[PDB]
Amino acid sequence: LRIYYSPSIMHRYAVVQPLHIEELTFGAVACLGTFSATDGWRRSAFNYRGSSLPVVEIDSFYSNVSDWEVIL
Amino acid sequence: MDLKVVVSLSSRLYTDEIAKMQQRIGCILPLASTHGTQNVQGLGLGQVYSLETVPDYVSMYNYLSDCTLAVLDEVSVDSLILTKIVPGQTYAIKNKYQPFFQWHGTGSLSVMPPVFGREHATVKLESNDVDIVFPMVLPTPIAEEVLQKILLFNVYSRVVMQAPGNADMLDVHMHLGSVSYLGHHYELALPEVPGPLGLALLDNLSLYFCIMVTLLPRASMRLVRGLIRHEHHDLLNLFQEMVPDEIARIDLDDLSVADDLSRMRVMMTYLQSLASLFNLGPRLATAAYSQETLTATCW
Amino acid sequence: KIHPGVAMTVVRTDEILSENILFSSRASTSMFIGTPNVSRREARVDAVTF
Numbered sequence: 217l218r219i220y221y222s223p224s225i226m227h228r229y230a231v232v233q234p235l236h237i238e239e240l241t242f243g244a245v246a247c248l249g250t251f252s253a254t255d256g257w258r259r260s261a262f263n264y265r266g267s268s269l270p271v272v273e274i275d276s277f278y279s280n281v282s283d284w285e286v287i288l
Numbered sequence: 289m290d291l292k293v294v295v296s297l298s299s300r301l302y303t304d305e306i307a308k309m310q311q312r313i314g315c316i317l318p319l320a321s322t323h324g325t326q327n328v329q330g331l332g333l334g335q336v337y338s339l340e341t342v343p344d345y346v347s348m349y350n351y352l353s354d355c356t357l358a359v360l361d362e363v364s365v366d367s368l369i370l371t372k373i374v375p376g377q378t379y380a381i382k383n384k385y386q387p388f389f390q391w392h393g394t395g396s397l398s399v400m401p402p403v404f405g406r407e408h409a410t411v412k413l414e415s416n417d418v419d420i421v422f423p424m425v426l427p428t429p430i431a432e433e434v435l436q437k438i439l440l441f442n443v444y445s446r447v448v449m450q451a452p453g454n455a456d457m458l459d460v461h462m463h464l465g466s467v468s469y470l471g472h473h474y475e476l477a478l479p480e481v482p483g484p485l486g487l488a489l490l491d492n493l494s495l496y497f498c499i500m501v502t503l504l505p506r507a508s509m510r511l512v513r514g515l516i517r518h519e520h521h522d523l524l525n526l527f528q529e530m531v532p533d534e535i536a537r538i539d540l541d542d543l544s545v546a547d548d549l550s551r552m553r554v555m556m557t558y559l560q561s562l563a564s565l566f567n568l569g570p571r572l573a574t575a576a577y578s579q580e581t582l583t584a585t586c587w
Numbered sequence: 588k589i590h591p592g593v594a595m596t597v598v599r600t601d602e603i604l605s606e607n608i609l610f611s612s613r614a615s616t617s618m619f620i621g622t623p624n625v626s627r628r629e630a631r632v633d634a635v636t637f
Contacts, residue, residue, distance in 0.1 A: 240554065283560075288499060
């Protein structure tokens, strides 16, 4: 997560915004649950009112919500 | 439902090492792939831990969480029968490990690479030229302490590389290499050069350190100064009549309640993330244990 | 294209596809065959593995 958001951390931390005490928090992570490994990601079109969007579909999902953790 | 693991040897094991593997009966080890049939190369922690290579415990301790865990059941010359650990099943486990730290329900069992020794935890198989590195399992506070010892020695080694030698060296290796328990002392094997991924973990902790160091509450520092001046506890044993210089110059401002409230709130959000960072290991909760049989009922 | 002070040798390896013949005399191996087992495990929410 950190090495993913490193360019965005660079840009947002940049010069546009210096500091204030509430502004220090940056990101939040929560887990939605366990998915069967090696099944993969099933790509499908979503058609509404004559328009299409690419959508991934996840088979056999197991739901388990966790709390929020701060990342920075 | 019916978790069943049988691992086939290509050639029959020697008449000596069959006895040694029988001595290893009833022990957790991590395996590669969740299948009823496995080749011996995937089995055990052998392939990543090399005698030729400098040991990275952080790399091992990452690798073991990635593997699914298992328990040895039957040792034969032809094949090894193991049962596997599903997250939601309750298992009978017996403590047969050679260091023998006493187990209680107070801690969840944590599984670590063999930080103590190299040779004794491992069994070589020259019949099929591969090595089995059994993991070492320990209760929770000893595991936390040993991980702390490893990271602190990483930091002080990287510092002491261009520092004076004999004084700083012979002070550091006092009570960091050796963990002292009731009636006993044991020497941790620590890496000579820490280069991969331990320092990355320490960098990750220093990120949170640099963020938290701005948002500290002032009145607690005032309370520490007033306590170390007036009274004494074992919490206050580290500070004698001297006060460190930093705290007075951070102290000099007055107290405003809402600022300390906001600082406490942000630090409160952050410490849960640090609690997420410290674990890095599969934790198995202990609900029952019999000392006379050395037998726990894990979860 | 001036010759250097030394000469040189080259070593190569090659791989050849071969359709092979296997001969075996009669009754050379005794085989023991067991009852097969069928087990079930690790039921997904929409699947079961056997």
